[PDB]
Design a protein around this ligand. Structure first.
Ligand SMILES: CCCCCCCCCCCCC/C=C\[C@H](O)[C@H](N)CO
Ligand SMILES: CCCCCCCCCCCCC/C=C\[C@H](O)[C@H](N)CO
Lengths: 30, 241, 273, 224, 192, 224, 74, 148, 49, 30
């Protein structure tokens, strides 16, 4: 993220973290 | 020189921006600052000072404008009569508009915290009695009798040497913050109601006055916070000054 | 972690009784688990395809139209050089269908305003965009006293300059915005009138947008303003099935009951393509 | 082993000899409100055993030309049991839910049901439930073929006769009112129509049973 | 997995629900045909009714293996077997079962386990495929899917003669998409 | 555990939920020709995946008065698939076989079949098979009651609905021609006749599926 | 952090107005003199009058245009 | 004022000046004025194949190629990257005729398998067709081989 | 902000310039490059045939 | 190469590496 002001919500989107949890919706079986 | 590019945000004058500008006076030194008592470092410091609340905001004429600061109390037939009710919404127009907390809160959209209302008795020394003050959370309409009002959180006030009691309105809500309540859709943020009921009577011996008055002071607790600054809803001018 | 797609391992034929990857029981409610290397004979493939374009930020950080304001010279809408627009996103289908896939979202915003004449020509003119939070005094004319913007943020810009843009935080009292609200906003009796407030969530009403041409008398050009919105730092929860039929009203799932249409296309017979 | 099942909570018990395992909604068991999530200042009440038990709501019949039914939560229980009494005597409410759907037939019947839970079910244009008018678009302009993205189970008359779903508290606020907001709605739609030949029993009732889990209340006042 | 609309024949309002299943009954045991369709997720057709099909419309190119699951919803005493075949690109629609059995296929047996899954492996010449459409863009066609009777649909006396099948489709663990675009359908007819 | 079964080879798969285990012919899995057994001097070709897969041949009906059917191997596959093309383009051939017979009915039907493999089935006096005329003497002067000495299985309609046999290469030569010699013949005879009461489904088809294993070819020439 | 003095006062507000008409009686000679005062408008005055003594710097911004809002080279 | 919109294959193509597809909800778009310096963007490699090819000896469909398919001879689907859309932002007709010129520059270039260069004139796009009646030598000509 | 100055070379489109431009597709990954025989790395390589 | 964005394909051309394999086309003899 690149920022030029004093507020964190004025920065760029940046690069997220590649994580997946496909079992939350596909395999919710106890 | 150095090649640059212009992003689509140039040449705009944004009022709330924080920026650097060229000074007009080079090498200027201001007058030294001496110690002056009574410095404010936060608007929340003076949001916890009790101020007079206008519960009895019935009259309107010029000569009786002072009667709005207190409401009367006298002897009844001992049937648990009602005294006065109002809504405990600091930002909504009403009795709370006469306090410093109410005026300051108009500059901020959302608030959160616990309030506190203090009642003082200003009768003769020989007059005694007890009163019940109840706070009805949202959802319940105005109580129709004392036996229905006693269900919510309440405090019993006893006249005596200590002439003041404080009813604390705890922060009970579903959301973390509340916007200012108003009639219509925005009633979703209504905080509740406050009622005052006779407990036993207002007893007074012979040779003493039959009518007394109560003064109510309101303030905020130590967890009161506000955010999202805006402009007030009232403009105090009717043209050029 | 899942930076790339999964590989494929070498497999051979299997003839044994008791283990059956193919047969399943979908009544349980869980998706399948049989893979390619367990129903056919496969080879070794080293997959290196990136999955970075399907993230929430990669899918929502694109600008879209959400607003339209007209300031005509002769007409009936805004003939006084000022306009008031309540902030809503549900006004246009492309963005609405995208954002309605989920139930709760939490995000910042970047707003860009493009202004020009109805014919597309650019003329020298000055304006003032004013953000009016709920409970603030709303202007009622071109010379209203509320335009002093003593506390409310405001922007002064010209048509000939590049379009102005600002960054916007998350201002909801709740923990996230919600596009569906199954309930009513008041403790009333809900006889008939309250039904017009069905689904009206006070946590989504963020304020009002005000625009005027800076001046005392009437201007000389008709003007149009277009508001574009872009999302960043996006989080989502609880996905729901996507929209099927046309839209009718803002903030309402109403649909045309007499004209109902299938999701896709149709053919003549099931045994023929 | 996942063919017999017994679920007990409070002072009620449910048994079934043909089950289809148990679906946990979004892979999270219900829990209480943590000290960091709370916003109220008054200590809440947790009646525990007196409001966490199985309740039977009503019975609906399955016909060869039925469309479907849906219910709303927690609107159904506001007039039933100690859970109803506490709901109207308090302003803030939170809880989980365990839902059990029962429908049994013989070996010569056929048909299939789609049991699913859809949070924030806004309906476009009580405890007994309503009947859908346009089941293809779920009465809200969305296709039913994509409903499986929500926690769901199937009732196939040749395989099982029951479905179980456990749903935690789903909302954007730690507490909310139970008389003005419905967190989710339960849907039961017949995808494959019921069929049998003349002479078999033609009444195939469907009954709904459910039980709140980990309830909490706050904000006492008069009953509304 | 989401419900797939293989039987997308009807169109009228009152029978819009019949598109979710296709019937199966007893025949003369000559290997009759049941239903066919194209296995192109992005191309308009049966796949347009799934969440995978709708999402894929937002992305130009995709790669990976698909998976279609069939569930039988008949009476307990009805038994039978079916053959499901997937013809790779180049071969036209099979004219009979003996011609369809050449491609990759699976034999499905009715029983206690009522569901079988046919996996469509990623077989292609290019690393990615664009969305297929009629005309030049048929270069990216994935193939066809067919369902054939194996022996019969056998049923004793006192039991129904017609049953239905429900098909659910999804994607495997190596499915990826790229090059985000806008959808081809706009859900408005003017001002809202 | 020997009641469900899945057999996969190449790019085909076979599933069954009522099996009767698997019979391995003469207790030997198919294998390749060892360097000491070989006699050719040219390196053979092993197409592997392109010729080792399940093929479905034809469907025959079971009637209440049927006699029986028999097939010949590898004569059936010489006009089918890449196995057929390679057979006519090469002179020497060897392979194993895995054979699967399917026949299913309801619970109210009855009858039994005898599935067996008889090497070098010389017949006394294509891919669709033939029908026996004198099933008692196997059309070759030998009683059928002693057929069980060969690798065999049963199809009892009350117990199972399938039979599986794995047969290695059986011959006195390491390689042989596929267009002039038939290594073995498959026999399917109804010992107990089919029976049902009027109103049940009267069509009970029988279908044959099989797959070569560990094939080899040599001696390339023009197609014959 | 939003209720501090800097967070409450560091927002721009109107304090002045100057007219340079072509025909009129106020400033028909193309020049104007304006004494520096803040008490000319209510919104800012009410805000700043909450206290008795203040000590601060300032940032002044001047916006100029024709009475109709048009921008001309001058 | 204008709006350049990049339409990938399969996206809705606009059909008028006020088309609903101009909302550019997902497709990239650029707003710019004539008086501003010319706009420019950077573009990645979007082919499904491993590289672009300017010659494709074959057909793109499994058909019978009777006569109609011959108009698709050499049509490579791996080179059709999309559509470019331009309009003047406004409701009514504009007041000036306009012309747009597109310039292209290459970077991070890799090449394979060089071939002989072109000789004759060009006739059609994506077609090596040439005028058969008017065939010309590669260079210039002289009168005799023993004289310059 | 930071005071700057403009040199007399702005707003010109120079064809041979090497410059930086804003990408149109954020987070895009191209198709992997397989080995293809016959790669040219310099126009002088095929100037000696 | 000089880059100001988060994407590598928006950078400048830069300076390549001077390598030649003239024998690939001129002397392909085994
Ligand atoms: C220069 C001032 C202009 C800034 C004004 C924009 C700030 C507020 C934008 C709100 C962001 C979107 C969230 C709003 C709520 C929901 O989208 C809708 N009300 C849906 O009901
Ligand atoms: C602001 C949007 C404009 C960007 C549009 C340009 C992006 C795509 C350019 C493609 C690059 C050249 C490669 C194209 C293919 C081949 O050149 C030709 N089709 C040859 O057949």
């Amino acid at each position: 993220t690149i920022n030029y002001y004093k507020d964190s919500y004025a920065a760029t989107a940046g690069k997220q973290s590649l994580k997946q949890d496909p079992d939350k919706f596909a395999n919710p079986v106890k | 020189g150095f090649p640059t590019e212009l992003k689509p945000g140039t040449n705009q004058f944004l009022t709330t921006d924080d920026g650097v500008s060229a000074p007009i006076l080079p090498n200027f030194h201001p007058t030294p600052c001496i110690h002056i008592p009574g410095e404010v470092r936060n608007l929340l410091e003076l949001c916890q000072v009790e101020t007079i609340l206008e519960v009895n905001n019935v009259p309107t004429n010029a000569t009786s404008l002072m009667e709005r600061l207190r409401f009367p109390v006298s002897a009844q037939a001992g049937k648990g009569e009602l005294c006065a009710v109002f809504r405990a919404d600091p930002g909504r127009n009403g009795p709370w508009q006469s306090t410093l907390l109410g005026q300051l809160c108009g500059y901020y959209t959302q608030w959160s915290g616990s309030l506190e209302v203090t009642f003082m008795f200003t009768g003769s020394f020989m007059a005694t009695g007890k009163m019940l003050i109840a706070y009805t959370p949202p959802g319940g309409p105005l109580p129709k009798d004392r036996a229905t009002a006693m269900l919510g959180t309440h405090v019993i006030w006893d006249f005596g040497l200590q002439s003041s009691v404080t009813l604390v309105i705890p922060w009970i809500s579903n959301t973390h913050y509340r916007a200012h309540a108003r009639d219509g859709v925005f009633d979703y943020y209504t905080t509740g109601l406050v009622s005052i009921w006779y407990q036993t009577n207002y007893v007074v011996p012979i040779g003493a006055p039959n009518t007394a008055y109560i003064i109510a002071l309101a303030a905020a607790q130590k967890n009161f916070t506000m955010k999202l600054c805006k402009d007030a809803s009232d403009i105090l001018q009717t043209g050029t000054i | 972690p899942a930076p790339t797609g999964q590989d494929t391992q070498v497999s051979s034929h299997r003839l044994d009784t008791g283990k059956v990857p193919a047969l399943q029981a979908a009544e349980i409610g869980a998706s399948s688990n049989a893979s390619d290397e367990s129903m056919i004979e496969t080879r070794c493939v080293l997959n290196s395809h990136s999955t970075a374009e399907t993230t929430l930020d990669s899918f929502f950080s694109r600008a879209g139209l959400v607003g339209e304001i007209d300031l005509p010279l002769k007409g009936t809408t805004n003939p006084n050089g000022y306009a008031n627009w309540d902030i809503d996103i549900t006004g246009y289908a492309q963005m609405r269908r995208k954002v309605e896939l989920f139930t709760y979202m939490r995000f910042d915003a970047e707003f860009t305003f493009v202004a020009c004449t109805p014919t597309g020509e650019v003329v020298p003119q000055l304006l003032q965009y004013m953000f009016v939070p709920p409970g603030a005094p709303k202007p009622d004319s071109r010379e209203s006293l509320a335009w002093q913007t003593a506390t409310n943020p405001s922007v002064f810009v010209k048509l000939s300059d590049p379009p102005a843009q600002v960054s916007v935080p998350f201002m909801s009292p709740a923990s996230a915005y919600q596009w569906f609200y199954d309930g009513y906003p008041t403790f009333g009796e809900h006889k008939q009138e309250k039904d017009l407030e069905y689904g009206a969530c006070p946590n989504n009403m963020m304020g009002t947008f005000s625009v005027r041409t800076v001046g005392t008398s009437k201007s000389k050009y008709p003007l149009v303003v277009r508001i574009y919105m872009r999302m960043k730092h996006v989080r989502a929860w609880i996905p729901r099935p996507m929209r099927n039929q046309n839209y009718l009203f803002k903030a309402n799932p109403n649909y045309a009951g007499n004209s109902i249409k299938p999701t896709g296309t149709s053919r003549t017979a099931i045994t023929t393509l | 082993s996942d063919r017999v099942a017994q679920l007990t909570i409070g002072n009620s018990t449910i048994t079934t000899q043909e089950a289809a395992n148990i679906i946990v909604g979004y892979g999270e068991w219900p829990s209480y409100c943590s000290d960091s999530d709370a916003t109220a200042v008054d200590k809440p009440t947790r009646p525990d055993v007196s409001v966490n038990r199985f309740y039977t709501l009503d019975t609906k019949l399955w016909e060869k030309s039925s469309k479907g039914w849906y219910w709303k939560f927690p609107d159904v229980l506001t007039e039933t049991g100690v859970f109803g009494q506490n709901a109207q005597f308090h302003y803030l409410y939170r809880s989980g839910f365990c839902i059990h759907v029962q429908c049994n037939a013989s070996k010569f019947h056929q048909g299939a049901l789609l049991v699913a839970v859809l949070p924030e079910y806004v309906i476009g244009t009580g405890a007994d439930g309503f009947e859908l008018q346009h089941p293809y678009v779920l009465d809200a302009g969305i296709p039913i073929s994509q409903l499986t993205v929500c926690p769901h189970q199937w009732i196939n008359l040749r395989t099982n006769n029951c479905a179980t779903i456990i749903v935690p508290y789903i909302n954007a606020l730690p507490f909310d009112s139970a008389l003005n907001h419905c967190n989710f709605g339960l849907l039961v739609v017949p995808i494959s129509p019921l069929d049998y030949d003349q002479g078999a029993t033609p009444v195939i009732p469907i009954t709904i049973t459910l039980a709140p889990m980990c309830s909490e209340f706050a904000g006492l006042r008069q009953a509304v």
